[PDB]
Amino acid sequence: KVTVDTVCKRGFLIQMSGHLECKCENDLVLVNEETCEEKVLKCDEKTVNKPCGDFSKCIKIDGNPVSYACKCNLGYDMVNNVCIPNECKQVTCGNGKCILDTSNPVKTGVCSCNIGKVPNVQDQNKCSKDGETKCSLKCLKEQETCKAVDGIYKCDCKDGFIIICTG
């Protein structure tokens, strides 16, 4: 489980209403929940088992002729051209995304919302209710605090600094 102490290799923590996850540096893709790597742009014979997207790898398919495809990892399904958990295949959250609830033996796909929104118990726990979420990210690098960027919490340079953060 991703925590506020998780180191995101080639990435960084982001926070939503109900969970934390790792987000990759520009043009990188998730090969694991804590690991980002470069992505192949086209699966071919020299790119088998190499990353081609978030939680997807290149596979060879023996046939006439031989074919190559980008395949989601185990437990993930291709939905709107992105690999998401199979428990989330039918979950639409609105102002948020679907994550895995593992608090019961039977896992379920539930919604985690953009900052300012929380799951609405009166609306299938979709992200249709206004609610506050306090940031918990430890942003211990030089001149950066927790900032809400495109509806998610992340560590970002303080007001007046740019990328380490410099004036």
Partner: antibody
Amino acid sequence: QVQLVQSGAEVKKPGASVKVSCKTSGYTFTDYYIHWVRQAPGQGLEWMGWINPTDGGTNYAQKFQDWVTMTRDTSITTAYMELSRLRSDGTAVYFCARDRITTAAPFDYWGQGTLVTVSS
Amino acid sequence: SYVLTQPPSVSVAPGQTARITCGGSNIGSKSVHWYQQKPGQTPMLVIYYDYDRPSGIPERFSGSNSGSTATLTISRVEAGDEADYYCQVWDSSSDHVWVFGGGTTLTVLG
């Protein structure tokens, strides 16, 4: 441990009403829907509807909209289903079941069922 | 109305493999759940979200879902697997209902 405990068997006359209960325990009541499923003898499972424990909101299958009323008591984490104007051929077993409040969550726990026999 | 179509009966000998189909319009885009009901007993989840398996369910139970058919596969069938099996999906459309299949009776010839 999650438990859904339904009330005992019922015997009713045609045209009468009956109110079956589903006592829940072992989990946060307001996080899961309570569904009711009807099963006539020798027949298949039939979803009737759900209740939302937080606001008492209900969602019924159209065929049960007219004679089924679902309620709940949050203080004792119990769900209720009231059948009205029972038909003489309406003997059936009724199950309660839960699933996470979200889209398309599976029914992971079920009550043991309640037989309602209809005879004049 | 959205409909799930199951065969009424499947018969297998012990040790054989049983397959139970669940047909539906674009069922591959829906999350399919499977329930086992032994005679006179409470329905019980055996497969959820197409192919996830609850703890206690043996590995020989497996599910798949693609196109218009979701399938429950039971390898090395045992006498204890004799039961009715129901598939289930949520209809995201305006009708806004849960749907059960007609049920499949699995006979294990002992």
